Amino acid sequence: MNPPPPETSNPNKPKRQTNQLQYLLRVVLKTLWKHQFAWPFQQPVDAVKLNLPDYYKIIKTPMDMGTIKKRLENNYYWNAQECIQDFNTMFTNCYIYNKPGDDIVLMAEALEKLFLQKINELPTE
Ligand SMILES: CN1CCN(C(=O)c2cccc(CN3c4cccc5c4C(=Cc4cccnc43)N(C)C5=O)c2)CC1
Q: Where is the crosslink of kind Glycyl lysine isopeptide (Lys-Gly) (interchain with G-Cter in SUMO2)?
């Protein structure tokens, strides 16, 4: 069964726009989105659809690139590091829920490498 997806707005949280956050949307997220292995990560895990009734019994901090994209579009984050943490949570969730060598894990491994390549150098303020 599915919990509510992670919030993409929160009026009690302050918003911010920075050059680095703009880059995380325009270049990092939007390039990863087009990778051949991006599709499992473009929306919250639908445990009912995918017949993964254990998914949210295991994964307590779910995250995906659809949520990240909406957060970036909504200026939800304070800084680039907060957004980067959401990407890292997404990848770690995949490693936690699965096991080494699974096709889904090979996909996450490739995307994580591309992600790190792209965030190695960010624009300055
Ligand atoms: C039963 N077979 C299925 C094939 N298989 C895989 O390796 C495998 C590879 C790619 C996609 C899937 C199915 N799926 C999904 C499944 C499992 C874990 C996870 C997922 C996901 C996301 C996901 C998204 C859309 C559709 N489908 C998903 N995310 C984040 C996950 O952590 C499974 C394992 C054995």
A: 57
Binding-site residues, ligand 1, Cβ < 6 A = 40-41, 45, 50, 94, 97-98, 102-104
Method used for this model?
X-ray
Q: Resolution of the coordinates in A?
A: 1.4
Residues 6 or more apart in contact with residue 31 via CB below 8 angstroms: 114, 118
CA 2 to chain centroid, in Å, comes to 18
Identify which of 64, 104, 109 to mutate to test ligand 1's pocket (most ligand atoms within 8 A of the CB): 104
Whole-Å CA distances, 4 to 27, 45, 55, 63, 82: 28, 11, 13, 12, 21
**Residues whose CB is less than 8 angstroms from the CB of residue 88 and which lie 6 or more positions away in sequence, other chains included:** none
- Tell me the domains of the chain and their CATH numbers: 18-122 (1.20.920.10)
Distance CA 2, CA 20 (A): 33
